[PDB]
Design a protein around this nucleic acid. Structure first.
Length: 135
RNA sequence: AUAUGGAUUCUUCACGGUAACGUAACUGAAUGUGGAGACGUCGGCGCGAGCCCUGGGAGGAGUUAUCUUUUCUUCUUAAC
């Protein structure tokens, strides 16, 4: 009866990313010395790709499909779990507790996440995840 | 009207905080939505400003047969 697993998709509810979909990578149920609460390490989308029609040229399609990712430690109370799933094995090793608290390692993980999201978006799958929420 | 500095970009249009949110900055046309402009009267209570009262001290003046370390007066600080 536990659903906050390592591939669950949730919606951020607070903190500059509210209304943006996210996928849980590493959960921490019994808190930690820092962040003494139930929290998860998540990677999400900050700038969703724009809709592409058949009239768009080669240059414009590549521009409109760019995705800007982010990584964040989020309290459980600030997430809204969904029923969707997204495999994270391609980038689970690069995001962890170590990659935070260091500016250089945060950017290295983000570009790896960006490449994974771009390839996932191409050859369309997980269409709900890449669709911007309307509110 | 315009230039320089700063900021931003090879992940093109910034990062931090669990969060409330923070910052020297940190593209946004049509169209749409929201806020400010924009609001009665009476009652007590809290707080601020000016005034009033008052202690010590540094100056000036008055009274002094007798008494009064005394009576009066100056000691101020704007927008931004």
């Amino acid at each position: 009866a536990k659903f906050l697993k390592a591939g669950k998709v949730a919606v951020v509810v607070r903190g500059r990313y509210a209304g943006k979909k996210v996928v849980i990578v590493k959960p921490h149920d019994e808190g930690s010395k820092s962040h003494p609460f139930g929290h998860a390490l998540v990677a999400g989308i900050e700038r969703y790709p724009l809709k592409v029609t058949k009239k768009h040229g080669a240059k414009k399609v590549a521009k409109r499909t760019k995705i800007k990712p982010f990584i964040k430690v989020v309290n459980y109370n600030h997430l809204l779990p969904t029923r969707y799933t997204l495999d994270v094995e391609a980038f689970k090793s690069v995001v962890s507790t170590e990659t935070f608290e260091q500016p250089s390692q945060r950017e290295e993980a983000k570009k790896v996440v960006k490449k994974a999201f771009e390839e996932r978006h191409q050859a369309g799958k997980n269409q709900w995840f890449f669709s911007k929420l309307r509110f």
